[PDB]
Write a structure and sequence with these properties.
PDB class: cell adhesion
Strand content: 25-35%
Distance between the termini: 26 Å
Largest sheet: 2 strands, antiparallel
Assembly: monomeric
Radius of gyration: 11 Å
Number of domains: 1
Strand order of the largest sheet: 1-2
CATH architecture: Ribbon
CATH class: Mainly Beta
Oligomer: monomer
Number of strands: 4
Entry title: Epidermal growth Factor-like domain 2 from Toxoplasma gondii Microneme protein 6
Structural class: mainly beta
Shape: globular
CATH topology: Laminin
CATH superfamily: Laminin
Name: Micronemal protein 6
Helix content: under 10%
Keywords: EGF, Toxoplasma gondii, apicomplexa, protozoa, Cell adhesion, Cytoplasmic vesicle, Membrane, Transmembrane, Virulence
């Protein structure tokens, strides 16, 4: 959620763009909900990010 200056957690674009996946601040910090055609991936450092599944599935 975009607070004002830094959205916090979503401030680094965890799931990338909105079209890729939406981020929600949770107990653990944040989670990523990828849209139809995208998937969850840990990008090397274990960060929860959203990547393309292929195109639209």
């Amino acid at each position: 959620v975009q607070l004002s200056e830094t959205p916090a957690a979503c401030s680094s674009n965890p799931c990338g763009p909105e079209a890729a996946g939406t981020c929600k601040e949770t107990n653990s910090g944040y989670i990523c909900r990828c849209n139809q055609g995208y998937r969850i991936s840990l990008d090397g450092t274990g960060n929860v990010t959203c990547i393309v599944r292929q195109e639209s599935g």
